[PDB]
Amino acid sequence: LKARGGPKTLRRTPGVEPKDIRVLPGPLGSGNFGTVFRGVFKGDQDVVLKNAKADVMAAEELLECEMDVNYHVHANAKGTCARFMGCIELGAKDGGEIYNGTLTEGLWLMWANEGENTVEALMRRGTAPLATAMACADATELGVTKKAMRELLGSLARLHECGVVHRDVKPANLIAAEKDGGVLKLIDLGAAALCLPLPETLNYYPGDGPADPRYAKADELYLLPPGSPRPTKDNAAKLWEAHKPDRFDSWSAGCVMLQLAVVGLRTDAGLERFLADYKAVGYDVNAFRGEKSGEYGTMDFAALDANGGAGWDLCQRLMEAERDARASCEAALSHAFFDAAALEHH
Amino acid sequence: LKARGGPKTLRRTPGVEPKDIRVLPGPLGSGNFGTVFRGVFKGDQDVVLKNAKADVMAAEELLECEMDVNYHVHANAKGTCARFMGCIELGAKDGGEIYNGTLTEGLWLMWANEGENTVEALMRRGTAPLATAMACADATELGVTKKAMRELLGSLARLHECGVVHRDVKPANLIAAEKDGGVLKLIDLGAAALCLPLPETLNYYPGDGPADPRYAKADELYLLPPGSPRPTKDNAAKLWEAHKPDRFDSWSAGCVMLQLAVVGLRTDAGLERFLADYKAVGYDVNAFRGEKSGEYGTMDFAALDANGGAGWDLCQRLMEAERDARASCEAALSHAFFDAAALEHHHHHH
Ligand SMILES: Nc1ncnc2c1ncn2[C@@H]1O[C@H](COP(=O)(O)OP(=O)(O)O)[C@@H](O)[C@H]1O
Ligand SMILES: Nc1ncnc2c1ncn2[C@@H]1O[C@H](COP(=O)(O)OP(=O)(O)O)[C@@H](O)[C@H]1O
Ligand SMILES: [Mg+2]
Ligand SMILES: [Mg+2]
């Protein structure tokens, strides 16, 4: 007697059939566990597609979690991130070839193509093309920083409200969405955690996890400290208050702000130099300004200096050494930095 | 008073200056922690260049370990892997732009370009193009498997002899080196460990390190099993004998053999299907043949069947469930699979 075969179960999104998707050859890029491609959905919709790397441990499971968090965000925080269009799962026989424009075997996630340009690419081209992409009328460091940070902090606040910590906030993961007025949208929930039981936490555990070293405080690569209890439906709220995992995003947002506000900090080496000096003076912005800024003769800190040093103060709040002292993204949003100009004389 | 500052320090290899390197846009590939590009050195030497990914934690440290291991291999096991040409470190102001064909800020590693096609690429195009690339006169599955495995196992034996476990053995990390008679060379020591204190172990720790699941036994994604002693100068030799981290490479080599030997196993899905069945029958090759091979009417196991099933037996040796039973790469080399046939080549022999 031989064991019988049986059907394969495949995950599918209503309205999305494999026949509807053409994949464009050539990866947009690759992350720790997956690869991203451009595609065309139903003949005339520009989309982006992600699959799991065949050569990476647990890649499918990592992509499944990214899927779960994408559904959560789609339901609870629309507009914060690239629009999620669901998934498509293919078997081996029915898998095609990327270079021939067809989806290969495995799980694929699909989003709208929100734009060809990331904030990292734009800022490095310059403040002008960045402002243009963002539809930002004040095409200065201060202007783009105000608009971008209001949008970023607003979106992070909404994500945190529904229990999601993004965990990979940085210019490379922001797109100025031209079809939506240039507003910034986050991408890449590949490292995101769901930190409340809805119905269960996801990708949320004690100890260090994936982090971009440029945008994570070097001694804080965790959402929950290594000593923390494992999260459960019963202790999740307590852990959120105790360990403030959302403050991981706050620090990253501060890094974004520094790069938007100061042209010389837009290279990796530039921001790295700043953060090393910032740590050296005890994560004290005023100490940096007094002891270190004189060393930065090739840079212009005017955007941070403006209006009683409002920008510096906001960076300080977002980048306090201690999480318990560090501003939430919601609180940061109410900062003087974002105040409307008084008496504009129209 | 003001702090005085001072010069930057940059790592360099004598005879290799960044002005002499042109980088070609378009990553050749990207792994877990780095990105590889084609380059041209001194206007006419085809090279390959690797830097760290800026977005990956400690990619910097991983690239440094890859560098160290490459220096070790260059000194102790020449010809086993792509020829290592050294490092080039660039600073901020002297750093360039990939689009301008210049090396960017940070540490770079450089190797000779050993060939445009990997064994993975070749085998999937067919045994014929693979055999041609390997200069393999016997252009059959058996022929290419014999020649490739002799070369691979020989090189793994040399690497293990100098304390190095490659940890990423697979067809994608083998190149048939056109300029050295088609002989296979390993690439990508990015996951490699130096497992002996020479003078210090490198990238060697208990627990599931990086592993390509296709080429790693599902429950053996480690070199050293967790909890077991952290590697130190005086427990190193002990751990080598006890946990046999080199047998990680043995299993991978078995996977390579399966794909070389059986065309149907050259796809990810094909090899995956086989290993699942192999696991299902208790990692017993004869049981697979007896209970399962009837389900593989799509495929041809002739290369493994040949000569009293010598190929099957070598696979069994390289792929024992238990490391304590699994052949070393050195031991595998003397297997009957590699024997010359009686009177082989008699018709032209002098
Ligand atoms: N929804 C989207 N719309 C437009 N572009 C996207 C979207 N999602 C991802 N991308 C792009 O896909 C790419 C992913 O590549 P990335 O992770 O940066 O690879 P690497 O780390 O090798 O640079 C990024 O350039 C990103 O801008
Ligand atoms: N020394 C070398 N000579 C020629 N090609 C090389 C060398 N080192 C690396 N490469 C090529 O660089 C590429 C790295 O790509 P990667 O994504 O790391 O692996 P994969 O082939 O699994 O995608 C490989 O295609 C490999 O053939
Ligand atoms: Mg003012
Ligand atoms: Mg760098």
Tab-separated table of N, CA and C in Angstrom, chain B residues 66-182:
chain	number	residue	atom	x	y	z
B	66	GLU	N	35.496	37.609	6.227
B	66	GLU	CA	35.692	37.058	4.888
B	66	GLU	C	37.098	37.393	4.382
B	67	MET	N	37.509	38.635	4.597
B	67	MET	CA	38.848	39.054	4.228
B	67	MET	C	39.905	38.197	4.919
B	68	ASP	N	39.797	38.064	6.241
B	68	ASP	CA	40.770	37.286	7.016
B	68	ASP	C	40.849	35.846	6.498
B	69	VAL	N	39.692	35.220	6.312
B	69	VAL	CA	39.653	33.840	5.837
B	69	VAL	C	40.262	33.752	4.438
B	70	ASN	N	39.970	34.730	3.581
B	70	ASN	CA	40.581	34.764	2.245
B	70	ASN	C	42.111	34.840	2.309
B	71	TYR	N	42.639	35.644	3.224
B	71	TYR	CA	44.079	35.713	3.413
B	71	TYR	C	44.616	34.367	3.872
B	72	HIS	N	43.880	33.708	4.761
B	72	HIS	CA	44.287	32.388	5.247
B	72	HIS	C	44.317	31.367	4.110
B	73	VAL	N	43.263	31.359	3.309
B	73	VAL	CA	43.160	30.415	2.209
B	73	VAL	C	44.238	30.681	1.164
B	74	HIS	N	44.542	31.958	0.940
B	74	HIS	CA	45.538	32.331	-0.055
B	74	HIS	C	46.909	31.799	0.342
B	75	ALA	N	47.191	31.830	1.639
B	75	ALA	CA	48.486	31.397	2.155
B	75	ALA	C	48.582	29.876	2.254
B	76	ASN	N	47.453	29.218	2.513
B	76	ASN	CA	47.467	27.793	2.853
B	76	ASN	C	46.807	26.801	1.882
B	77	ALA	N	45.939	27.289	1.006
B	77	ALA	CA	45.169	26.397	0.133
B	77	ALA	C	44.942	27.022	-1.241
B	78	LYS	N	46.034	27.430	-1.884
B	78	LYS	CA	45.979	28.046	-3.209
B	78	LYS	C	45.344	27.150	-4.253
B	79	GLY	N	44.462	27.727	-5.059
B	79	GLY	CA	43.812	26.983	-6.116
B	79	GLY	C	42.476	26.374	-5.727
B	80	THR	N	42.186	26.306	-4.430
B	80	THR	CA	40.896	25.751	-4.004
B	80	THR	C	39.758	26.729	-4.289
B	81	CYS	N	40.034	28.029	-4.171
B	81	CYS	CA	39.001	29.068	-4.296
B	81	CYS	C	39.444	30.127	-5.292
B	82	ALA	N	38.549	31.048	-5.633
B	82	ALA	CA	38.931	32.144	-6.527
B	82	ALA	C	40.136	32.896	-5.982
B	83	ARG	N	41.048	33.254	-6.883
B	83	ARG	CA	42.292	33.881	-6.473
B	83	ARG	C	42.033	35.229	-5.814
B	84	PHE	N	42.528	35.385	-4.587
B	84	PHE	CA	42.303	36.590	-3.783
B	84	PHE	C	43.384	37.633	-4.050
B	85	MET	N	42.955	38.835	-4.413
B	85	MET	CA	43.872	39.901	-4.829
B	85	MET	C	44.055	40.981	-3.778
B	86	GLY	N	43.359	40.843	-2.659
B	86	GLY	CA	43.508	41.774	-1.552
B	86	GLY	C	42.310	42.656	-1.273
B	87	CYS	N	42.575	43.757	-0.583
B	87	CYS	CA	41.524	44.690	-0.206
B	87	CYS	C	41.861	46.094	-0.696
B	88	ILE	N	40.850	46.954	-0.734
B	88	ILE	CA	41.057	48.370	-0.998
B	88	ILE	C	40.058	49.115	-0.129
B	89	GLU	N	40.526	49.958	0.772
B	89	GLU	CA	39.614	50.753	1.588
B	89	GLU	C	39.615	52.219	1.163
B	90	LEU	N	38.436	52.772	0.912
B	90	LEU	CA	38.326	54.168	0.507
B	90	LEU	C	37.716	55.017	1.598
B	91	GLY	N	38.135	56.268	1.664
B	91	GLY	CA	37.558	57.203	2.597
B	91	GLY	C	36.410	57.968	1.974
B	92	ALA	N	35.907	58.945	2.712
B	92	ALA	CA	34.764	59.736	2.241
B	92	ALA	C	35.075	60.641	1.050
B	93	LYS	N	36.075	61.510	1.179
B	93	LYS	CA	36.325	62.459	0.097
B	93	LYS	C	36.910	61.791	-1.146
B	94	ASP	N	37.673	60.727	-0.933
B	94	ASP	CA	38.279	59.987	-2.036
B	94	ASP	C	37.342	58.906	-2.578
B	95	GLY	N	36.264	58.638	-1.843
B	95	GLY	CA	35.257	57.691	-2.287
B	95	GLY	C	34.483	58.239	-3.471
B	96	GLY	N	34.101	57.353	-4.386
B	96	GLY	CA	33.470	57.769	-5.620
B	96	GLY	C	32.020	57.356	-5.718
B	97	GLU	N	31.619	56.969	-6.927
B	97	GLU	CA	30.243	56.608	-7.230
B	97	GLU	C	30.262	55.423	-8.188
B	98	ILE	N	29.478	54.389	-7.890
B	98	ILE	CA	29.464	53.207	-8.746
B	98	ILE	C	29.107	53.623	-10.168
B	99	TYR	N	28.176	54.564	-10.297
B	99	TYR	CA	27.756	55.001	-11.624
B	99	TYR	C	28.891	55.656	-12.423
B	100	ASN	N	29.820	56.303	-11.722
B	100	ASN	CA	31.010	56.870	-12.354
B	100	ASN	C	32.142	55.861	-12.544
B	101	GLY	N	31.895	54.607	-12.170
B	101	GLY	CA	32.885	53.560	-12.327
B	101	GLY	C	33.993	53.574	-11.290
B	102	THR	N	33.749	54.245	-10.168
B	102	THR	CA	34.759	54.378	-9.127
B	102	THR	C	34.297	53.777	-7.812
B	103	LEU	N	35.252	53.268	-7.040
B	103	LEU	CA	34.936	52.604	-5.780
B	103	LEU	C	34.445	53.581	-4.731
B	104	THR	N	33.369	53.200	-4.056
B	104	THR	CA	32.755	54.052	-3.050
B	104	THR	C	33.441	53.914	-1.687
B	105	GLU	N	33.178	54.875	-0.811
B	105	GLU	CA	33.662	54.867	0.561
B	105	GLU	C	33.437	53.526	1.260
B	106	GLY	N	34.504	53.012	1.868
B	106	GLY	CA	34.426	51.800	2.658
B	106	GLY	C	35.391	50.725	2.184
B	107	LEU	N	35.289	49.570	2.824
B	107	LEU	CA	36.193	48.462	2.539
B	107	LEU	C	35.711	47.625	1.352
B	108	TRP	N	36.647	47.298	0.464
B	108	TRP	CA	36.386	46.454	-0.702
B	108	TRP	C	37.318	45.257	-0.708
B	109	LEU	N	36.805	44.118	-1.163
B	109	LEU	CA	37.642	42.952	-1.432
B	109	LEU	C	37.691	42.696	-2.932
B	110	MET	N	38.813	42.166	-3.417
B	110	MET	CA	38.964	41.927	-4.847
B	110	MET	C	39.503	40.527	-5.131
B	111	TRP	N	38.929	39.877	-6.148
B	111	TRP	CA	39.411	38.579	-6.630
B	111	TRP	C	39.535	38.592	-8.147
B	112	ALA	N	40.302	37.645	-8.692
B	112	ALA	CA	40.286	37.432	-10.128
B	112	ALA	C	38.903	36.974	-10.546
B	113	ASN	N	38.451	37.422	-11.710
B	113	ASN	CA	37.255	36.842	-12.297
B	113	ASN	C	37.621	35.459	-12.831
B	114	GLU	N	37.106	34.413	-12.185
B	114	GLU	CA	37.502	33.037	-12.539
B	114	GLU	C	36.704	32.440	-13.693
B	115	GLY	N	35.635	33.113	-14.098
B	115	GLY	CA	34.812	32.636	-15.196
B	115	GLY	C	33.409	33.208	-15.134
B	116	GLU	N	32.760	33.320	-16.287
B	116	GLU	CA	31.446	33.952	-16.335
B	116	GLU	C	30.313	33.015	-15.906
B	117	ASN	N	30.564	31.717	-15.813
B	117	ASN	CA	29.461	30.809	-15.501
B	117	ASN	C	29.694	29.881	-14.307
B	118	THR	N	28.696	29.815	-13.430
B	118	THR	CA	28.745	28.964	-12.241
B	118	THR	C	28.311	27.571	-12.643
B	119	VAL	N	28.623	26.598	-11.801
B	119	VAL	CA	28.216	25.229	-12.068
B	119	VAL	C	26.690	25.130	-12.046
B	120	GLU	N	26.052	25.949	-11.216
B	120	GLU	CA	24.592	25.985	-11.180
B	120	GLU	C	24.041	26.401	-12.539
B	121	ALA	N	24.576	27.490	-13.079
B	121	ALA	CA	24.112	28.005	-14.366
B	121	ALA	C	24.363	26.996	-15.481
B	122	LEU	N	25.564	26.430	-15.494
B	122	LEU	CA	25.938	25.482	-16.527
B	122	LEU	C	25.106	24.208	-16.465
B	123	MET	N	24.976	23.627	-15.275
B	123	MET	CA	24.282	22.348	-15.145
B	123	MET	C	22.827	22.473	-15.577
B	124	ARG	N	22.252	23.644	-15.342
B	124	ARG	CA	20.859	23.874	-15.687
B	124	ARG	C	20.658	24.089	-17.186
B	125	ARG	N	21.707	24.538	-17.867
B	125	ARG	CA	21.684	24.614	-19.319
B	125	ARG	C	21.877	23.226	-19.914
B	126	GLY	N	22.660	22.394	-19.233
B	126	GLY	CA	22.796	21.007	-19.630
B	126	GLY	C	24.158	20.421	-19.329
B	127	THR	N	24.214	19.095	-19.318
B	127	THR	CA	25.452	18.377	-19.055
B	127	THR	C	26.498	18.691	-20.113
B	128	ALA	N	26.062	18.903	-21.356
B	128	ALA	CA	26.992	19.242	-22.438
B	128	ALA	C	27.747	20.559	-22.207
B	129	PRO	N	27.020	21.666	-21.998
B	129	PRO	CA	27.757	22.910	-21.752
B	129	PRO	C	28.593	22.838	-20.471
B	130	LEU	N	28.105	22.124	-19.459
B	130	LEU	CA	28.870	21.975	-18.224
B	130	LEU	C	30.183	21.227	-18.492
B	131	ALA	N	30.092	20.112	-19.213
B	131	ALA	CA	31.263	19.311	-19.559
B	131	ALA	C	32.269	20.090	-20.393
B	132	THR	N	31.769	20.880	-21.335
B	132	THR	CA	32.637	21.711	-22.163
B	132	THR	C	33.388	22.716	-21.298
B	133	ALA	N	32.667	23.367	-20.396
B	133	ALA	CA	33.276	24.339	-19.490
B	133	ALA	C	34.315	23.712	-18.560
B	134	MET	N	34.067	22.469	-18.150
B	134	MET	CA	34.961	21.731	-17.260
B	134	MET	C	36.110	21.029	-17.995
B	135	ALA	N	36.139	21.134	-19.324
B	135	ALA	CA	37.071	20.344	-20.139
B	135	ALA	C	36.969	18.857	-19.804
B	136	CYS	N	35.736	18.389	-19.653
B	136	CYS	CA	35.487	17.019	-19.215
B	136	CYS	C	35.233	16.141	-20.439
B	137	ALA	N	36.178	15.256	-20.756
B	137	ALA	CA	36.103	14.472	-21.992
B	137	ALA	C	34.911	13.521	-21.992
B	138	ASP	N	34.590	12.988	-20.818
B	138	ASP	CA	33.430	12.123	-20.659
B	138	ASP	C	32.208	12.995	-20.376
B	139	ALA	N	31.496	13.360	-21.441
B	139	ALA	CA	30.429	14.358	-21.351
B	139	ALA	C	29.086	13.713	-21.029
B	140	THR	N	29.052	13.024	-19.900
B	140	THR	CA	27.848	12.385	-19.404
B	140	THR	C	27.668	12.818	-17.966
B	141	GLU	N	26.495	12.559	-17.399
B	141	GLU	CA	26.287	12.837	-15.980
B	141	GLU	C	27.373	12.170	-15.126
B	142	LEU	N	27.641	10.900	-15.395
B	142	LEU	CA	28.653	10.188	-14.638
B	142	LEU	C	30.005	10.870	-14.811
B	143	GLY	N	30.334	11.212	-16.054
B	143	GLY	CA	31.598	11.860	-16.371
B	143	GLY	C	31.802	13.162	-15.620
B	144	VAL	N	30.822	14.062	-15.704
B	144	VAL	CA	30.971	15.352	-15.038
B	144	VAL	C	30.943	15.201	-13.518
B	145	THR	N	30.160	14.252	-13.014
B	145	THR	CA	30.082	14.053	-11.574
B	145	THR	C	31.428	13.584	-11.032
B	146	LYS	N	32.020	12.596	-11.697
B	146	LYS	CA	33.352	12.121	-11.315
B	146	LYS	C	34.388	13.242	-11.286
B	147	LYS	N	34.487	14.002	-12.370
B	147	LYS	CA	35.505	15.038	-12.454
B	147	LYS	C	35.230	16.165	-11.451
B	148	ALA	N	33.990	16.640	-11.405
B	148	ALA	CA	33.671	17.756	-10.510
B	148	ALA	C	33.828	17.360	-9.047
B	149	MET	N	33.354	16.167	-8.682
B	149	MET	CA	33.412	15.765	-7.280
B	149	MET	C	34.845	15.500	-6.824
B	150	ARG	N	35.687	14.981	-7.718
B	150	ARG	CA	37.082	14.759	-7.358
B	150	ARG	C	37.727	16.100	-7.022
B	151	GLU	N	37.415	17.109	-7.833
B	151	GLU	CA	37.977	18.446	-7.634
B	151	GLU	C	37.404	19.110	-6.384
B	152	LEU	N	36.096	18.988	-6.197
B	152	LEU	CA	35.450	19.626	-5.055
B	152	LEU	C	35.896	18.988	-3.749
B	153	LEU	N	35.894	17.662	-3.706
B	153	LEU	CA	36.257	16.990	-2.475
B	153	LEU	C	37.724	17.221	-2.169
B	154	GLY	N	38.562	17.250	-3.205
B	154	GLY	CA	39.974	17.545	-3.019
B	154	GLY	C	40.201	18.904	-2.387
B	155	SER	N	39.499	19.905	-2.897
B	155	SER	CA	39.625	21.259	-2.372
B	155	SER	C	39.053	21.394	-0.955
B	156	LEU	N	37.896	20.791	-0.704
B	156	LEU	CA	37.349	20.793	0.649
B	156	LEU	C	38.306	20.116	1.624
B	157	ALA	N	38.940	19.024	1.198
B	157	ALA	CA	39.906	18.350	2.060
B	157	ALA	C	41.066	19.290	2.412
B	158	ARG	N	41.552	20.040	1.428
B	158	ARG	CA	42.621	21.000	1.676
B	158	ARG	C	42.189	22.128	2.602
B	159	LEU	N	40.986	22.643	2.392
B	159	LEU	CA	40.451	23.696	3.257
B	159	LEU	C	40.302	23.168	4.687
B	160	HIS	N	39.706	21.989	4.836
B	160	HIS	CA	39.565	21.426	6.175
B	160	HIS	C	40.915	21.202	6.853
B	161	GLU	N	41.913	20.802	6.071
B	161	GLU	CA	43.247	20.596	6.590
B	161	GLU	C	43.842	21.876	7.183
B	162	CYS	N	43.463	23.031	6.642
B	162	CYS	CA	43.989	24.258	7.226
B	162	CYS	C	42.950	24.934	8.134
B	163	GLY	N	41.956	24.153	8.549
B	163	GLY	CA	41.011	24.579	9.571
B	163	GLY	C	39.782	25.317	9.087
B	164	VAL	N	39.628	25.438	7.773
B	164	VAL	CA	38.526	26.202	7.199
B	164	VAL	C	37.357	25.301	6.795
B	165	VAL	N	36.158	25.650	7.251
B	165	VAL	CA	34.931	25.029	6.771
B	165	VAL	C	34.191	26.073	5.945
B	166	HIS	N	33.865	25.715	4.711
B	166	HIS	CA	33.342	26.688	3.767
B	166	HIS	C	31.924	27.148	4.151
B	167	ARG	N	31.070	26.184	4.505
B	167	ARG	CA	29.715	26.452	5.007
B	167	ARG	C	28.714	26.959	3.967
B	168	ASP	N	29.157	27.109	2.723
B	168	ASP	CA	28.223	27.481	1.663
B	168	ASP	C	28.525	26.763	0.355
B	169	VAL	N	28.814	25.472	0.472
B	169	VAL	CA	29.114	24.668	-0.697
B	169	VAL	C	27.820	24.390	-1.446
B	170	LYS	N	27.823	24.660	-2.746
B	170	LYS	CA	26.676	24.426	-3.617
B	170	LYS	C	27.118	24.757	-5.034
B	171	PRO	N	26.393	24.256	-6.043
B	171	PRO	CA	26.778	24.559	-7.426
B	171	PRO	C	26.901	26.052	-7.736
B	172	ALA	N	26.098	26.878	-7.078
B	172	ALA	CA	26.144	28.313	-7.316
B	172	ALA	C	27.461	28.926	-6.861
B	173	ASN	N	28.167	28.228	-5.976
B	173	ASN	CA	29.449	28.714	-5.462
B	173	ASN	C	30.637	27.942	-6.026
B	174	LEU	N	30.443	27.358	-7.203
B	174	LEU	CA	31.533	26.719	-7.926
B	174	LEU	C	31.632	27.326	-9.317
B	175	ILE	N	32.855	27.605	-9.756
B	175	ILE	CA	33.067	28.105	-11.103
B	175	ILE	C	34.052	27.200	-11.816
B	176	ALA	N	33.735	26.827	-13.052
B	176	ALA	CA	34.679	26.062	-13.856
B	176	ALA	C	35.682	27.072	-14.414
B	177	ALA	N	36.911	27.021	-13.910
B	177	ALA	CA	37.874	28.088	-14.181
B	177	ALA	C	38.514	27.929	-15.561
B	178	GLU	N	38.029	28.696	-16.534
B	178	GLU	CA	38.474	28.573	-17.918
B	178	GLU	C	39.996	28.680	-18.023
B	179	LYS	N	40.572	29.595	-17.252
B	179	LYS	CA	42.010	29.866	-17.335
B	179	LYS	C	42.887	28.917	-16.525
B	180	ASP	N	42.270	27.940	-15.879
B	180	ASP	CA	43.009	26.869	-15.232
B	180	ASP	C	42.433	25.518	-15.645
B	181	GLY	N	42.237	25.375	-16.951
B	181	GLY	CA	41.903	24.089	-17.544
B	181	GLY	C	40.490	23.618	-17.255
B	182	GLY	N	39.653	24.510	-16.739
B	182	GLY	CA	38.274	24.158	-16.458
B	182	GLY	C	38.042	23.581	-15.080
